[PDB]
Design an enzyme around this catalytic site. Sequence first.
Site, PDB file in Angstrom:
ATOM      1  N   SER A  64      43.637  32.934  36.314  1.00 33.88           N
ATOM      2  CA  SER A  64      42.608  32.301  37.136  1.00 33.88           C
ATOM      3  C   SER A  64      41.378  31.824  36.365  1.00 33.88           C
ATOM      4  O   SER A  64      40.600  31.028  36.862  1.00 33.88           O
ATOM      5  CB  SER A  64      42.183  33.235  38.265  1.00 33.88           C
ATOM      6  N   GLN A 120      47.642  31.249  48.070  1.00 30.54           N
ATOM      7  CA  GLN A 120      48.778  30.492  47.543  1.00 30.54           C
ATOM      8  C   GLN A 120      49.303  29.484  48.557  1.00 30.54           C
ATOM      9  O   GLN A 120      49.065  29.615  49.756  1.00 30.54           O
ATOM     10  CB  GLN A 120      49.930  31.424  47.142  1.00 30.54           C
ATOM     11  N   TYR A 150      39.154  32.278  48.765  1.00 27.01           N
ATOM     12  CA  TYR A 150      39.619  31.986  47.414  1.00 27.01           C
ATOM     13  C   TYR A 150      41.044  31.421  47.479  1.00 27.01           C
ATOM     14  O   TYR A 150      41.911  31.991  48.140  1.00 27.01           O
ATOM     15  CB  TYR A 150      39.554  33.264  46.587  1.00 27.01           C
ATOM     16  N   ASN A 152      44.150  28.933  45.466  1.00 23.90           N
ATOM     17  CA  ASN A 152      44.781  28.102  44.456  1.00 23.90           C
ATOM     18  C   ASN A 152      45.106  26.675  44.933  1.00 23.90           C
ATOM     19  O   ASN A 152      44.794  25.729  44.227  1.00 23.90           O
ATOM     20  CB  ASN A 152      46.005  28.803  43.844  1.00 23.90           C
TER      21      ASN A 152
END
Length: 357
Positions: A64, A120, A150, A152
């Site tokens: 990350s 994800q 948070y 991705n």
Amino acid sequence: NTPKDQEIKKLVDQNFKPLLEKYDVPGMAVGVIQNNKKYEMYYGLQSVQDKKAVNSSTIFELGSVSKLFTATAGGYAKNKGKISFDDTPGKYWKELKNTPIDQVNLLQLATYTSGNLALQFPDEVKTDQQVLTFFKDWKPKNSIGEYRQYSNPSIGLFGKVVALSMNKPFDQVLEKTIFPALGLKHSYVNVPKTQMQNYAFGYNQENQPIRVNPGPLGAPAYGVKSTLPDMLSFIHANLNPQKYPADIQRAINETHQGRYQVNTMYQALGWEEFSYPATLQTLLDSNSEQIVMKPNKVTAISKEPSVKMYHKTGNRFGTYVVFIPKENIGLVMLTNKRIPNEERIKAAYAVLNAIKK
């Protein structure tokens, strides 16, 4: 070596070294940069099967911490006028024009506030085509801009847009533009054949070596690989952006600007920002399950703290980076095995609090 070399070696031996045995971590590199002098400590194995020891050429997966490079690329593009943070993704990725995701701006994507993007992609989203379809099919949930989760996919879309705006694939943005501007020599999205002998294997929870290319839009979220010397150079650039040419200096500075607050944490681009000194509890809280895994309401800021520090944690990616501008000091930890984030934060806190000025 100098008294400083010995002092830092002792502190790292005391605070980082014991983590190898405690978590059965094969290899570790820990670096400190203080007053523009670099100090490098290496332990253990880059590859267990090859009995290759970690050294200054060892390339680690950043996990990350990759997001810091995506943030820098975004700062670069913004400051060259290639994007505005008020733009929406469909301005660049044309297939997203007039879809709901085209109501979210680039800053919101970069800082995880779309209101409906999880850590994800869904399991079924496995290819580039499928990622585009996912974004076309997306609908909002939480009020856009109001909740940090948070994500991705969120920063992945940001990275893709940045690449589109610069007319080159993301891997080339980093390898041809950003890494050279930062003076990095062995940082990669794709490790070349000539460097494979230096590329550390990652190790899962069963101590088995794992090596995959990133998923679709994975590179901006978790796909960068680098060495300890390169990462110390990257910290130097963050501590001394004024010493760099304008285009990259402006990019670095852009990543340091807090955009909103969640309790004691300020979300900058990639970096998490705190008032300095930050208590240990503040630093630990930033990576609690509540903050990392769940949506949290953001609060607008009218100002950043007067004195600041920054960190980012990198789940087989045991990476941590932190720097404190006022003290011209930073630290980097790279490993090829999972270590709980709290242990990384605590170890770095002890070292940075103990090092002599």
